[PDB]
Write a protein that holds these residues in place. Structure first.
Motif, PDB file in Angstrom:
ATOM      1  N   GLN B 298       0.843  -1.178   0.000  1.00 40.43           N
ATOM      2  CA  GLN B 298       0.000   0.000   0.000  1.00 40.43           C
ATOM      3  C   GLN B 298       0.881   1.231   0.000  1.00 40.43           C
ATOM      4  O   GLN B 298       1.779   1.358   0.837  1.00 40.43           O
ATOM      5  N   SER B 299       0.618   2.130  -0.939  1.00 37.50           N
ATOM      6  CA  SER B 299       1.420   3.328  -1.099  1.00 37.50           C
ATOM      7  C   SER B 299       0.506   4.536  -1.175  1.00 37.50           C
ATOM      8  O   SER B 299      -0.528   4.507  -1.857  1.00 37.50           O
ATOM      9  N   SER B 300       0.956   5.607  -0.516  1.00 38.34           N
ATOM     10  CA  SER B 300       0.210   6.833  -0.251  1.00 38.34           C
ATOM     11  C   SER B 300      -0.508   7.403  -1.466  1.00 38.34           C
ATOM     12  O   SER B 300      -1.519   8.098  -1.319  1.00 38.34           O
ATOM     13  N   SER B 304      -2.060   0.165  -4.624  1.00 39.58           N
ATOM     14  CA  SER B 304      -2.276  -1.010  -3.799  1.00 39.58           C
ATOM     15  C   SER B 304      -2.072  -2.263  -4.631  1.00 39.58           C
ATOM     16  O   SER B 304      -2.505  -2.333  -5.783  1.00 39.58           O
ATOM     17  N   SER B 305      -1.407  -3.246  -4.035  1.00 36.39           N
ATOM     18  CA  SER B 305      -1.206  -4.538  -4.665  1.00 36.39           C
ATOM     19  C   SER B 305      -1.356  -5.619  -3.610  1.00 36.39           C
ATOM     20  O   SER B 305      -1.187  -5.372  -2.413  1.00 36.39           O
ATOM     21  N   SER B 321       5.627  -4.191 -10.680  1.00 37.00           N
ATOM     22  CA  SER B 321       6.321  -2.932 -10.868  1.00 37.00           C
ATOM     23  C   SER B 321       5.789  -1.865  -9.934  1.00 37.00           C
ATOM     24  O   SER B 321       4.774  -2.036  -9.253  1.00 37.00           O
ATOM     25  N   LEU B 322       6.511  -0.755  -9.910  1.00 38.46           N
ATOM     26  CA  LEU B 322       6.301   0.316  -8.948  1.00 38.46           C
ATOM     27  C   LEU B 322       6.615   1.629  -9.660  1.00 38.46           C
ATOM     28  O   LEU B 322       7.805   1.921  -9.912  1.00 38.46           O
ATOM     29  N   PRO B 323       5.590   2.421 -10.067  1.00 40.09           N
ATOM     30  CA  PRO B 323       5.856   3.579 -10.934  1.00 40.09           C
ATOM     31  C   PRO B 323       6.073   4.914 -10.231  1.00 40.09           C
ATOM     32  O   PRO B 323       6.683   5.817 -10.812  1.00 40.09           O
ATOM     33  N   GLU B 324       5.580   5.067  -9.004  1.00 39.84           N
ATOM     34  CA  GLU B 324       5.572   6.378  -8.366  1.00 39.84           C
ATOM     35  C   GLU B 324       6.985   6.811  -8.000  1.00 39.84           C
ATOM     36  O   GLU B 324       7.765   6.032  -7.446  1.00 39.84           O
ATOM     37  N   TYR B 329       6.502   2.900   0.289  1.00 39.97           N
ATOM     38  CA  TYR B 329       5.794   1.662   0.026  1.00 39.97           C
ATOM     39  C   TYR B 329       5.652   0.845   1.294  1.00 39.97           C
ATOM     40  O   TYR B 329       6.642   0.363   1.848  1.00 39.97           O
ATOM     41  N   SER B 330       4.419   0.705   1.750  1.00 40.52           N
ATOM     42  CA  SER B 330       4.101   0.030   2.994  1.00 40.52           C
ATOM     43  C   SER B 330       3.755  -1.415   2.702  1.00 40.52           C
ATOM     44  O   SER B 330       2.721  -1.702   2.093  1.00 40.52           O
TER      45      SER B 330
END
Ligand SMILES: *[C@@H]1O[C@H](CO)[C@@H](O[C@@H]2O[C@H](CO)[C@@H](O)[C@H](O)[C@H]2NC(C)=O)[C@H](O)[C@H]1NC(C)=O
Ligand SMILES: *[C@H]1O[C@H](CO)[C@@H](O[C@@H]2O[C@H](CO)[C@@H](O)[C@H](O)[C@H]2NC(C)=O)[C@H](O)[C@H]1NC(C)=O
Ligand code: NAG
Ligand code: NAG
Ligand code: NAG
Ligand code: NAG
Ligand code: NAG
Lengths: 726, 344, 49, 49
Positions: B298-300, B304-305, B321-324, B329-330
């Motif tokens: 979970q990211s601000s 969410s994944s 993947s993670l674009p931000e 990243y929690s």
């Protein structure tokens, strides 16, 4: 330097107390020692401590409980903590769930039908003080591998108990047994026969050489048949002296018996029969073996014959003119004369007077003659400034069996005194050897041993006087201890000094005495000793009786002396079956050899040793002088070794072990009452000795084997004599 | 034995390979008994040659193997007891027991033969047996270890790694949380960490000259020592923490990457200790019942994944993947079964 | 003929030592490598056993 | 093995004699494997011939 030394037998009898000693000296007195005996696997720890000072020996008796396993190893560590010093040293100690030494005693040896066997059982510890204890099992076993009686789970309170058991009218015959089983799984046995028989009333006895040799043309022989009250018996005698193992096949009906010579006699009314025989018929040679003599007295007016087997082992020996040692120093030293006293004997065991001999001390080049005196003794002395290891021999004849030794069919020899000795390692060049009384040692008496102490340079810096410390070791443990200091001559070698010590009791039939002197430079010397202590007990005991009497003369007494608060087991027995068949190993010697681990000598097997690290091996040995030459191991005696064959182990820092380098890294009017027994009872000894009233059995005439076996917690056990009541 | 345990703990096994290995183990055990000493010590040749004395490190190696072999198959306690008391017998008052060099090859042993390292390998081989720290022998051992550690720590060089690592592992076996903390900190200082893992190495260029073929007379022993480092990280008195496990993961990644296609690893020692280490890792991490793991990222920026991990997909690499740009990243994990989460 | 063989090589100390020959250069050897010979009385050749 | 059974059946045993016998059994087993045949058969000498 400040010095310590802690000593303890390598073995540990558990469930009891065991002694170990410590020496301390030369500074920083306020020291604390601590022994930690620890069970490595899993974990156990028994901790002991002491605080001590300089110039003192003292011994503590620490106790040990039982364990899981019967026999184990344990890490014994010791910590010395002086206010400015610390030392630690460990090793392996053999611990053992010792089995108490126990035994039996019967009323009789053999038995006939209809009677009742009666016996007693006894147990003791290392100290022969009595021990109360629960026994798991004892039982009586019938000859077919089957059992006849049994008793279980019973506790000794006086350190003994008594039992009986009645036999049937038609049981099995033969060698019955009784057996005990202890909680350890240790088992012990005491047999006894059962069968019909008659009661003897005489005993034949021969006189003849117990030992007969080659150079024998004849033989004295005599036949004397004791009777009731040791009176003379008339009748007939016939002896069969005999050689054995002739050329017969010992098979196909061929009797292995060689020449059996028979001599008759009319056994006279008074005195006893004699006969002088000739050995020419025996051929006292290679292939005619030992000498059995079977003497058969047929007593008249009964036709009753009885035999005695005698002198079967008359040693017809090849070794004739056998001389002996008595008091030989096992060792010699580079700076000393040793003097061996050496007796001479031959054959029978009689010394010869006035007989020249030759004595060859090799690697001392001491070829010296002497002669045999009235006691066959010679006290040869040899100065020793020589090489490592010495060999010594003495003879009366030369190094060969001079008359006809090479045939393969010869029978003769002569003994040769042979002995070897090794020297001490003493890098100080000082040492203390001891002159002992190395022969049989009586009991209840003091004795003085003497000591040849010598001091290379004396104390180098040190102080004025010096100290010696002696220990008398017994029964593989410790018994007695002491010391002695002396003002040293300023820089000189003083030789002689004596030591007296008591031989009350409480000491093994061997007495392993040692002593050792200590030097503030970190040095030390010493030397062992051994005394065959005569088999002798602490608790003196004695018996007596109101004297012999007539036939129904009922009122008689027995008396016993022992410790003032004790008990005694009293075996008066009609000595006819015992005349028929003897007793079995009942003596102080019984007690002594029943002991486990008579002598602690050398460590046990499972533990090997403790190694050290010093390797003085040079690249090249650095052998300055004319030439160079390689390294090698020595072979000589050591203080470490002295305390090894002593039996014990110790910790210290001084140079005890020789600096054995490390090996090479290079590689690629009367009414009969019961016979066969008179008295079989327990009694108590008051503080004035006991006196009971026995009751003269009628219609029986023989010896009366009285046996006294006494016991007290304080003085231990006691064995009193074979008092008759003829 | 260590590969036996690896198979049984990862659960990739069968009774057939089991039985064959068991036969191998009994056979090798007895053939090894045919080389030992009457005192209990052990030598290369030993029996049929009366004039001999055994070696120390070899006795210790056989002891450790007898230990774990007891752990799997049956073996008698008397042999280990006798070799143990023999190890004691060689020890000094405060110095540790010597090296009675009676070997034939330096390849079989990964260490430098130093008394420090030698005693370290020995005392740790002891402590692998369930042994109280209060024991005398081990008490003196820890004394040696503390002393040697201080000498090498305050000193600018004590080989900087292998000594220090073995010391670390033994100090961990003791109970000295503080001491293992400081030493592992020091080893962590001198790091040979890389793009996605960590390890350690010897000086990489010895100050004095060397040989020619593969640095002969110098196995370079990096796998075994890294494995012991790992092993040290894996052992605490209740259970290890998270951060030791992360370090263990990295060094294990290096380990498994450093495995030889022929099988085992570059030697027998390093292979053994590495498999021991991985076995203990899996005993910690590889739970065979924990089978219901749920991960939720979970990211601000409402990114969410969700992922699940069970036995069927135990070996699955779920990648996402993670674009931000600003990463916050929690991760939140629940259930049972450990999970590694590698991000780049 | 000067054989110096003791019974044993007579060391007092750590242990006893065995025998062995040596290997070092010599005056006799100097004059042998010289190629010549000589006669004297003094000790030229090492006291070989 | 049969005396092992006898001890364990009659109950006159202990773990010490048990362990020693167990070691004997493994040792004799393997020393016997050192005499068998590649087919599985067994010979007195067998292997190395
Ligand atoms: C196989 O590996 C497991 C991993 O836990 C070891 O641990 C045993 O696991 C089994 C699973 O049934 C348990 O019954 C045991 O109680 C665990 N402890 C043991 C037996 O040591 C185990 O050692 C290995 N063998 C198995 C599967 O028992
Ligand atoms: C020897 O003694 C027993 C006596 O019963 C033997 O029989 C086994 O006993 C156990 C007891 O739990 C049973 O579980 C087994 O089924 C029995 N048969 C076996 C184990 O083979 C046994 O053969 C031996 N060992 C013991 C005492 O079990
Ligand atoms: C062994 O260790 C424990 C530690 O608490 C101690 O309590 C115990 O008394 C020791 N001995 C035995 C037989 O357990
Ligand atoms: C013993 O006492 C003296 C004087 O206090 C001291 O110098 C010495 O270090 C102490 N320890 C020794 C000799 O081991
Ligand atoms: C024993 O033999 C000797 C002769 O050797 C003889 O004089 C003597 O009479 C014999 N008998 C006794 C009792 O000595
Ligand atoms: C032995 O030596 C002594 C002198 O000490 C001498 O009297 C004797 O003759 C020698 N032995 C013989 C057989 O002569
Ligand atoms: C012992 O014999 C040797 C021989 O040289 C001699 O030096 C020494 O003085 C003798 N000692 C005596 C007679 O006490």
């Amino acid at each position: 330097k400040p010095q310590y030394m802690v000593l303890v037998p390598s073995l540990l009898h558990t469930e009891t107390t065991e002694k170990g000693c410590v020496l301390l000296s030369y500074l920083n007195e306020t020291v604390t020692v601590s022994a930690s005996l620890e069970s490595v696997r899993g974990n156990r720890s028994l901790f002991t401590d002491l605080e001590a000072e300089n110039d003192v020996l003292h011994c503590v008796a620490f106790a040990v409980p039982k364990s899981s396993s019967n026999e184990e190893v344990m890490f014994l560590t010791v910590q010395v903590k002086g206010p400015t010093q610390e030392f630690k040293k460990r090793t392996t100690v053999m611990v053992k769930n010792e089995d108490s030494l126990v035994f039996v005693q019967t009323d009789k040896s053999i038995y006939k039908p209809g009677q009742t066997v009666k016996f007693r059982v006894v147990s003791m510890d290392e100290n022969f003080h009595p021990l109360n204890e629960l026994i798991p099992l004892v039982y009586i076993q019938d000859p077919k591998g089957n059992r006849i009686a049994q008793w279980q789970s019973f506790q000794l309170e006086g350190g003994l108990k008594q039992f009986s058991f009645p036999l049937s009218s038609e049981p099995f015959q033969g060698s019955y047994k009784v057996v005990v089983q202890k909680k350890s799984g240790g088992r012990t046995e005491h047999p006894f026969t059962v069968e019909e028989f008659v009661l003897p009333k005489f005993e034949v006895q021969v006189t003849v050489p117990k030992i007969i040799t080659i150079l024998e043309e004849e033989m004295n022989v005599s036949v004397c048949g004791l009777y009731t009250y040791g009176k003379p018996v008339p009748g007939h005698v016939t002896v069969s002296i005999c050689r054995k193992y002739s050329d017969a096949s010992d098979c196909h009906g061929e009797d292995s018996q060689a020449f059996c010579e028979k001599f008759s006699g009319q056994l006279n009314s008074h005195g006893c029969f004699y006969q002088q025989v000739k050995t020419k018929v025996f051929q006292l040679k290679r292939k005619e073996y030992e000498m059995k003599l079977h003497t058969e007295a047929q007593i008249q007016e009964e036709g009753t014959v009885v035999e005695l087997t005698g002198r079967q082992s008359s040693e017809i020996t090849r070794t004739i003119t056998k001389l002996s040692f008595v008091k030989v120093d096992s060792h010699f030293r580079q700076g000393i004369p040793f003097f061996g006293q050496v007796r001479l004997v031959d054959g029978k065991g009689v010394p010869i007077p006035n007989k020249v001999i030759f004595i060859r001390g090799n690697e001392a080049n001491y070829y010296s003659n002497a002669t045999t005196d009235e006691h066959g003794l010679v006290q040869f002395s040899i100065n020793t400034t020589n090489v490592m290891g010495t060999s010594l021999t003495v003879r009366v004849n030369y190094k060969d069996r001079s008359p006809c030794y090479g045939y393969q069919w010869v029978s003769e020899e002569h003994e040769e005194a042979h002995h070897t000795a090794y020297l001490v390692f003493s890098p100080s060049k000082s040492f203390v050897h001891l002159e002992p009384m190395s022969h049989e040692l009586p009991c209840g008496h003091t004795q003085t041993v003497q000591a040849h102490y010598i001091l290379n340079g004396g104390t180098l810096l040190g102080l004025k006087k010096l100290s010696f410390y002696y220990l008398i070791m017994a029964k593989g443990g410790i018994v007695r201890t002491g010391t002695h200091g002396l003002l040293v001559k300023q820089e000189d070698m003083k030789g002689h000094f004596s030591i007296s010590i008591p031989v009350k009791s409480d000491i093994a039939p061997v007495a392993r005495l040692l002593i050792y002197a200590v030097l503030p430079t970190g040095d030390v010397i010493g030397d062992s000793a051994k005394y065959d202590v005569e088999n002798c007990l602490a608790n003196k005991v004695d018996l007596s009786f109101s004297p012999s009497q007539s036939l129904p003369a009922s009122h008689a007494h027995l008396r016993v002396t022992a410790a003032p608060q004790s008990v005694c087991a009293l075996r008066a027995v009609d000595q006819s079956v015992l005349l028929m068949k003897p007793d079995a190993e009942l003596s102080a010697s019984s007690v002594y050899n029943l002991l486990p681990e008579k002598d602690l000598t050398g460590f046990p097997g499972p533990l090997n040793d403790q190694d050290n690290e010093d390797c003085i091996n040079r690249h090249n040995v650095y052998i300055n002088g004319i030439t160079y030459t390689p390294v090698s191991s020595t072979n000589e005696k050591d203080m470490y070794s002295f305390l090894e064959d002593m039996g014990l182990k110790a910790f210290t820092n001084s140079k005890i072990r020789k600096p054995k380098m490390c090996p090479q890294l290079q590689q690629y009017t009367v009414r009969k009452y019961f016979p066969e027994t008179w008295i079989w009872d327990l009694v108590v000894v008051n503080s004035a000795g006991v006196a009971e009233v026995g009751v003269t059995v009628p219609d029986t005439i023989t010896e009366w084997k009285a046996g006294a076996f006494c016991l007290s917690e304080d003085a231990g056990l006691g064995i009193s004599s074979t008092a008759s009541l003829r | 034995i260590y590969v036996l345990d690896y198979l049984n703990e990862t659960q990739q096994l069968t009774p057939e390979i089991k039985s064959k290995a068991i036969g191998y183990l009994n056979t090798g055990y007895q053939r090894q008994l045919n080389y030992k000493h009457y005192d209990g010590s052990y030598s290369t040749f030993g029996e049929r040659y009366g004039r001999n004395q055994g070696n120390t490190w070899l006795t210790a190696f056989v002891l450790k193997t007898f230990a774990q072999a007891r752990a799997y198959i049956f073996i008698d306690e008397a042999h280990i007891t006798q070799a143990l008391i023999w190890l004691s017998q060689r020890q000094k008052d405060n110095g540790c027991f010597r090296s009675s060099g009676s070997l034939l090859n330096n390849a079989i042993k990964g260490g430098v033969e130093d008394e420090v390292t030698l005693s370290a390998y020995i005392t740790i081989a002891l402590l692998e047996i369930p042994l109280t720290v209060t024991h005398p022998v081990v008490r003196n051992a820890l004394f040696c270890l503390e002393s040697a550690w201080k000498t090498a720590q305050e000193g600018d060089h004590g080989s900087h790694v292998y000594t220090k690592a073995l010391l670390a592992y033994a100090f961990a076996l003791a109970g000295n949380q503080d001491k293992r903390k400081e030493v592992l900190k020091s080893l962590n200082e001198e790091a040979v960490k890389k793009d996605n893992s960590v390890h350690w190495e010897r000086p990489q260029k010895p100050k004095a000259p060397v040989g020619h073929f593969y640095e002969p007379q110098a196995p370079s022993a990096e796998v075994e020592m890294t494995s012991y480092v790992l092993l040290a990280y894996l052992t605490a008195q209740p259970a290890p923490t998270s951060e030791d496990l992360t370090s263990a993961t990295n060094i294990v990644k290096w380990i498994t990457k450093q495995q030889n296609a022929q099988g085992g690893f570059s030697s027998t020692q390093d292979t053994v200790v590495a498999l021991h280490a991985l076995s203990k890792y899996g005993a910690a991490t590889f739970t065979r019942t924990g089978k219901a793991a749920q991960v939720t990222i979970q990211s601000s920026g409402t990114f969410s994944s969700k992922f699940q991990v069970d036995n069927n997909n135990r070996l699955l690499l779920q990648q996402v993947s993670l674009p931000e740009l600003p990463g916050e990243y929690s991760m939140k994990v629940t259930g049972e079964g450990c999970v590694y989460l590698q991000t780049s």
